[PDB]
Amino acid sequence: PPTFSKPAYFVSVLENIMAGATVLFLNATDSIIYSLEGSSQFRINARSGEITTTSLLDRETKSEYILIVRAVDNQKTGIATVNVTLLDINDNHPTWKDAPYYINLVEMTPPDSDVTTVVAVDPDLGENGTLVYSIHPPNKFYSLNSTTGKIRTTHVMLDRENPDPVEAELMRKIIVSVTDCGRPPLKATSSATVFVNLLDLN
Ligand SMILES: [Ca+2]
Ligand SMILES: [Ca+2]
Ligand code: NA
Numbered sequence: 001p002p003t004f005s006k007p008a009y010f011v012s013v014l015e016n017i018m019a020g021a022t023v024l025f026l027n028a029t030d031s032i033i034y035s036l037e038g039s040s041q042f043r044i045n046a047r048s049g050e051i052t053t054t055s056l057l058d059r060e061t062k063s064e065y066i067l068i069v070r071a072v073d074n075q076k077t078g079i080a081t082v083n084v085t086l087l088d089i090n091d092n093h094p095t096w097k098d099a100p101y102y103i104n105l106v107e108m109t110p111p112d113s114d115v116t117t118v119v120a121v122d123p124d125l126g127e128n129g130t131l132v133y134s135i136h137p138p139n140k141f142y143s144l145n146s147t148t149g150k151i152r153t154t155h156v157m158l159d160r161e162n163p164d165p166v167e168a169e170l171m172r173k174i175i176v177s178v179t180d181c182g183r184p185p186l187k188a189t190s191s192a193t194v195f196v197n198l199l200d201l202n
Contacts, residue, residue, distance in 0.1 A: 001076040004028040004069075009082045015059035015089045023051040028071035028078050038067040042084070051082065059086040060123045090128035090182030094120040099192035107158045107198050115142060115151040116194055120178045128182035136177055136191065139170050149176075151194070160198050172196050 004026065011024050023042065026034070026049040036044035036051065042065065044051045051067070065084040070077055097119040105115060122129040133149050135142065141158055144151045151174065158171050174194040179187045 001078065002028050002030045002032055002071050002073055003078040004071065004080040007080055009080060010085070011082065012085045012087055013057075015057055015086045016091065017053055017057060017086075019053060019056055021053055023053060023084060024082060025050055026069055026080065026082070028080070031073055033072050035070045035072075036067055036082075037070070039065050041065065042067055044069060057086055059088050059125070060092065062086075063088075088125035088128055090124055090180065090184065090186060092122055092124050092128075093186045094122045094131055094178050094180055094188040096120045096178070096188055096190075096192045101192070101194040102197070103194060104197045104199060105158070107160050107200055109153055109158060111153060111155045113153045115153060115174075115196075118144070118149040118151065118176050118178075118192060118194070120149075120188055120192075122180050124180065124182065128180055130181045131178055132181060133176055133178045136175055137170075139174055140167075141171050142174050144174075144176065158198060160200065172198060 013023055034044050034046050034049045036042060041055050041057060042051055043054050063086050067082040069080050069082055101116050103116050118133055120131050122131055132146050133144055135144050140156050141154055142151055143154050162168055175191045177187060177191040179185050
């Protein structure tokens with residue numbers, strides 16, 4: 001009544017595993033003909049018990065599969081589950097959420113005043129989905145919490161009556177770029193501008 005080495009099988013592959021690639025090898029005994037049910041993404045070779053992908057997978061669509069595998073020869077069936085888990089691979093860029101950002105700010109607003117919060121999103125997992133945010137070029141007027149996106153003013157004040165054009169530019173435009181922390185790291189297509197409309201206290 002032909003049965004497998006184990007009743008239940010646990011396997012891990014990577015979301016970029018190729019079309020056709022071997023997932024797992026199964027042998028049952030007490031000849032023997034094998035069949036696999038539970039996703040069309042997977043097929044099992046009927047003589048040899050080799051499970052393979054039929055297609056490309058994607059953990060962001062489906063991270064875990066359960067397949068059911070049957071061995072038959074007065075024939076008798078035997079059943080084992082196979083429990084495929086896809087390991088995340090860093091294959092999505094972050095995407096800016098509500099960019100660009102248009103804001104109105106009172107000049108000489110004091111140290112540590114709220115300005116905005118930039119937000120991006122990454123559908124990958126763990127380090128690959130973790131977002132880190134940076135102001136370029138180095139902006140002396142604004143400080144940004146690299147993990148949370150929140151932007152605040154600095155101990156340097158915002159003075160509209162400042163004659164350096166570049167410092168005025170810095171005051172009135174903030175450019176954030178965002179990465180994620182997998183290897184390779186991936187950045188959002190483009191940076192994201194906060195546009196700042198400076199207002200006196202008339
Ligand atoms: Ca992924
Ligand atoms: Ca990513
Ligand atoms: Na993907």
